[PDB]
Design a binder for this molecule. Structure first.
Ligand SMILES: C[C@H]1O[C@H](O[C@H]2[C@H](O)[C@@H](O)[C@@H](O[C@H]3[C@H](O)[C@@H](O)[C@@H](O)O[C@@H]3CO)O[C@@H]2CO)[C@H](O)[C@@H](O)[C@@H]1N[C@H]1C=C(CO)[C@@H](O)[C@H](O)[C@H]1O
Ligand SMILES: C[C@H]1O[C@H](O)[C@H](O)[C@@H](O)[C@@H]1N[C@H]1C=C(CO)[C@@H](O)[C@H](O)[C@H]1O
Ligand SMILES: C[C@H]1O[C@H](O)[C@H](O)[C@@H](O)[C@@H]1N[C@H]1C=C(CO)[C@@H](O)[C@H](O)[C@H]1O
Ligand SMILES: OC[C@H]1O[C@H](O)[C@H](O)[C@@H](O)[C@@H]1O
Lengths: 664, 664
């Protein structure tokens, strides 16, 4: 009754919504709709309007002032000009004199022109008028976000061990490599729960295999690590290698489980393994078949996974390759200088993630063929769903760690997201930061960035400041591209500073897990923009480098190089808290208003709100060893905090026994 | 105060310094010098040390925390990872408990590892121990900079019209193209003094030609523009087109003025015109010849030039083109996928600005041949030198507007610099801001960035914020690359806001010009880091997004999208001044400390120091029409300002009549 659905044309059913809403009849409530040039919604914003939403997209929390295109793409360079990243999250809220929310349930290229062409004009457009548009009324943005979280279904809930720290690198390939990562953290008493396994752990990049030479006794090595509270988290990619005798390949061909060209041939895309086929993620039998394959790893004691390249990413097709080799031949013997090297270079680039490739294959949805570009943004979503739904068939009682690169609203039910291939840039700390509340609005709460920066070479101080933000993000992992400077914590001087920052994480795990569980079970946000908590404060609403977490604290990470502190704005009196390197916890009461606060490199800051407190455990080196029986309570005297806690493994969430009231 | 010179091996004479310093024979006074593997200076920094310097290079004012390689390169993507931009400015100051400046007078690839490898370690190294190292000492960093400015000789001083606003775009081609730009500005009563002519004004990109089809009577068109106080500033590039009958070409080949390969043939490098030769800029006869060619344009009424592509940039050599074609041929006929597309993609990229190409040509220096790589960073410097020296021969009492892309210390005497191919990113406003004081330290005072962003698509608000920074940079011009969204001030709605911002530039010209002249004539800085003005204030010395200008004011531009103000730190009491859209000047006193200030998109902010004032003229539409007879004084009652003022055209600097003391 607070939300309505306006259907246009004959929309593909994306299954984003868990709740069935009936079709409205009245004219569209806001702005103007047009079908002349495909589809277009146009709305004139008031000058003070703020625009929230779009989950994992570029730029700031207030999306006004640029162009965002929902079209999942494998782009490893996240600069301010980019209009499309990995995610398609078609939820926005207009917040101001007139406030309302909009969800565009449409699975293809969707363009959000938010004040880019004209400052006061918001224009959302697509090629085909086949979509549902949900209008969500409410008092304010926050109320609107909660109604939306309601109808998209509960967010994915990870096992507790996943709130620990994790370390990965594109390049770990042997037992020796993993044993050295283990030794490096454990011997230095740096806390850690997870080590990620990247594509080198497979036999020639074949999904659902393990390198036979390097891991001849894999179940035994997995237990070797698990005995140390180190859980190996292996990657699975979208592309299944074309290879005779490889069982996943044979089965997909034989049973027509792969995406096909119009002529019914299995479509070929080059990725890490060379030529591959894509499983048909939109076909239920194909999804079930692919998901069940996870059994092969779970049977060996693996308790979590990550999916990459699920846009799906294409290095080139067979068609593109031939086109490029042909153009190259021309260039090769162009004596007249009619073919310039930049044309040769543009062609080589053009065959990567080519829009024309996305037009070359089809999904078989219950007998009916649909051309992939028409449902492009659903591929990653349905690949993750394949996995989620298999975990439930395989072990219904157990929580698995699961997250993916590309996504669509609806996938938030089956796994988290990481923010993809960022860079070792200071601007990416703030990018990681600003994406958080937006991802929360779209149901994606288990999320984080590659700490230290995935691409390029990091520095000791950059890695330390990344980690201090990572302290607060449910996914906290250090991951690095191949060829980059090594960025495990033990690669730098004065390693005690890394132990100090990660200790802060573990000491906060009971509290952070608690807020996440509370938020997930009540369709609420784990991170909130300040405006959500302080609607009446015209200064607060425009703050973009601070976030509220739960109902107790605010975070404000340092993201400028060489800085020894930062400016903050406090909408209410708060206690400025710092996790000090000696293990202590400094406290200072600061009043409402502007402040500059000192935050050294080896110090982790946060603020505790007036009349609140939070529990803080003593430092432990893994999640299982954290002591929750007697932890200190930091914050305001006389206040109380409701701690959610369960076994962190199963799905028994209701029980009154999961809650205890702590009182300072 | 003190300067010493330490000589290693047999340095190339760069002519950086104008003052002679005797060679020191005592121990090197700071850090360690090693010559076991080429050359390396190693210094252990104290923890609070700030490192200033490096002029035009990546990142912030404090250079600690990264790696900078002086190696002039044509790179249009200025992201945080880049180690080399256009500039090779080998001056750094270590500032802390122990303070000292070092200038590394070396013309080739020099690597500054400033806390990159180990946080506490500063390491400067190069391939050959053939260089001079100047050690400067004094009270503090500012003292040390001023002594450096003395020995490198007086900075280039532009004509007063160059303190106007200028408009450019790669694409202006015909007389209609230019008249429309003139029309767009003059009819909307937006001030402007200059329009830039990019490469398309030439006949087939030939240096020192004009397209005689589009400009049949060029000198008349030049006058037609000048009669409206609009001065065409044409570009000149380094590569002279290979073309029989082209006199510049024929003369260059005939007299051996071009850079030759090892065998004596004229080296061929492809640029805008296709095949070109490079004038041998380090050869005195060659320089005089090339420089003399500017007469062609001056004779037609041109009073300013800019140079680009003077790294020199190389799209490819004949040698590299042949290589890439040979590789493309193998890729083309490869059937066993042994040659992957990304290898083809890499080769294509590797032929641009190839380190191998910089080893393929030589300079003839007074009869001695030197391979170009060994003196690479001197090329752009000497190209700008050729122009400046030609100007003095042509008319020694007259100032020409001149600036270049690539440079080396010493070039600052002959022309200014623009910050090259930036992007329409909010983060480049900050990049622009931060590069300024560093450039000043190195003698480059006439400088600025492409306002609104060169590459990629700008927005109305990004342009307006970029122009409010431009108001204060001596070079203020809006420039864009081909294929970008058009970003002339008149390409946007509510054009009055652009009038307002440019109007502030013109109201401040008398003051900004006065400040520039006083700084230049006194070997002093126009822009200064807060640390130089408030050395004892430990908060002020860490500020990197505010700058002192002259001795009267401080600037603090907004560089955040959607921001309606920003945090500022005032190290003393100041008057907060804004030039309002309505042409009024808001004023508010603010005590020392941290403040949040409101700055609307259409307001230009600055601060006036306690006990100071500045002259503010009424808005005019060109420099010539500014009424400096009776300017309003803004700031503190009872304060005095010394206003420098000459004809802005000739070089009659030393008249006492040039100075007039004003008191508020
Ligand atoms: C110093 C150097 O510059 C000379 O060139 C011009 C200057 O750069 C201008 O600044 C300008 O100077 C004027 C004064 O500022 C002004 O107050 C007036 O009183 O006198 C000047 C007239 O405008 O004009 C200069 C005119 O050329 C000059 O070209 C150059 O030679 C000077 N360098 C020395 C070189 C020699 C060679 O023996 C001698 O002439 C002197 O020792 C130096 O002047
Ligand atoms: N780049 C993609 C591929 C690799 C290599 O597997 C992963 O390391 C990245 O995390 C993923 O995003
Ligand atoms: N890139 C170079 C190329 C062109 C074309 O002249 C200019 O527009 C740029 O300013 C210059 O730096
Ligand atoms: O061509 C796409 C990819 O090809 C190879 O995988 C390269 O290793 C990688 O750097 C590139 O992005």
């Amino acid at each position: 009754a607070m939300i309505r659905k306006y259907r246009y044309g004959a929309p593909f059913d994306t299954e984003a919504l868990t709740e069935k809403i009936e079709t409205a009849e009245e004219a569209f409530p806001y702005g103007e709709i047009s079908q002349k040039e495909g589809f277009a919604f146009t709305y004139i914003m008031d000058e003070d309007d703020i625009v929230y939403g779009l989950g994992e997209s570029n730029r700031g929390i207030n999306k006004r002032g640029y162009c965002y295109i929902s079209n999942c793409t494998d782009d490893p360079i996240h600069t301010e000009d980019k209009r499309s990243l990995y995610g398609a999250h078609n939820f926005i809220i207009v917040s101001g004199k007139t406030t309302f929310g909009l969800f565009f349930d449409y699975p293809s290229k969707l363009t959000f022109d938010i004040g880019y062409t004209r400052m006061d004009t918001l224009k959302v457009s697509c090629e085909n008028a086949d979509l549902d548009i949900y209008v969500i009324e409410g008092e304010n943005a926050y109320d609107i976000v909660k109604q939306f979280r309601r109808v998209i279904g509960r967010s994915y809930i990870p096992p507790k061990f996943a709130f620990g720290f994790g370390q990965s690198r594109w390049g770990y390939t042997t037992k020796e490599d993993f044993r050295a990562v283990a030794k490096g953290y454990r011997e230095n008493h740096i806390p850690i729960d997870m080590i990620y396994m990247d594509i080198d752990y497979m036999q020639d990049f074949k999904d659902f295999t393990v390198n036979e030479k390097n891991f001849p006794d894999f179940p035994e090595f997995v237990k070797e690590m698990k005995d140390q509270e180190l859980r190996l988290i292996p990657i699975i990619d979208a592309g299944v290698k074309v290879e005779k005798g490889y069982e996943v390949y044979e089965e997909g061909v034989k049973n027509n489980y792969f995406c096909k060209r119009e002529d019914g041939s299995d479509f070929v895309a080059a990725v890490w393994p060379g030529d591959t086929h894509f499983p048909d993620m939109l076909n239920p039998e194909a999804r079930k078949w692919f998901g069940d394959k996870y059994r092969f790893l779970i049977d060996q004691g693996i308790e979590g996974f990550w999916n990459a390249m699920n846009e799906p990413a294409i290095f080139y097709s067979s068609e593109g390759l031939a086109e490029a080799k042909e153009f190259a031949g021309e260039f090769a013997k162009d004596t007249e200088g009619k073919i310039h090297p930049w044309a040769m270079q543009a062609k080589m680039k053009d065959i990567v993630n080519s829009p024309e490739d996305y037009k070359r294959f089809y999904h078989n949805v219950n007998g009916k063929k649909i051309r992939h570009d028409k449902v492009h943004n659903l591929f990653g979503y349905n690949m993750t769903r394949a996995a989620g739904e298999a975990f439930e068939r395989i072990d219904p009682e157990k929580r698995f760690l699961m997250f993916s690169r590309s996504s669509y609203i609806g996938m938030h039910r089956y796994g988290g997201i990481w923010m993809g291939d960022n860079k070792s840039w200071w601007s990416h700390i703030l990018l990681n930061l600003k994406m958080l509340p937006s991802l929360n609005m779209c149901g994606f709460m288990y999320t984080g960035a590659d700490l230290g920066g995935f691409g390029d070479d990091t520095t000791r101080d950059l890695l330390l400041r990344f980690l201090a933000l990572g302290v607060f993000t449910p996914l906290m992992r250090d991951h690095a591209a191949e060829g980059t400077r090594e960025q495990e914590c033990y690669q730098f001087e004065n390693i005690e500073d890394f132990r100090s920052v990660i200790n802060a994480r573990y000491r906060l795990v009971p509290y952070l897990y608690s807020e996440y569980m509370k938020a997930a079970l009540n369709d609420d946000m784990y991170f909130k923009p300040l405006g959500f908590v302080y609607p009446d404060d015209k200064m607060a609403i425009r703050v973009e480098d601070q976030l509220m977490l739960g109902n107790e604290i605010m975070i404000a990470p340092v993201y400028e190089q060489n800085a020894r502190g930062r400016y903050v704005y406090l909408p209410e009196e708060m206690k400025f808290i710092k996790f000090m390197p000696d293990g202590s916890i400094s406290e200072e009461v600061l009043e409402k208003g502007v402040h500059y606060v000192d935050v050294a490199l080896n110090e982790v800051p946060l603020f505790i709100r007036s009349g609140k407190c939070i529990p803080v455990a003593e430092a432990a080196e893994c999640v299982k060893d954290i002591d929750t029986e007697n932890m200190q309570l930091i914050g305001y005297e006389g206040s109380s905090y409701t701690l959610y806690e369960d076994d962190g493994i199963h799905k028994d969430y209701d029980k009154k026994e999961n809650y205890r009231v702590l009182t300072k």
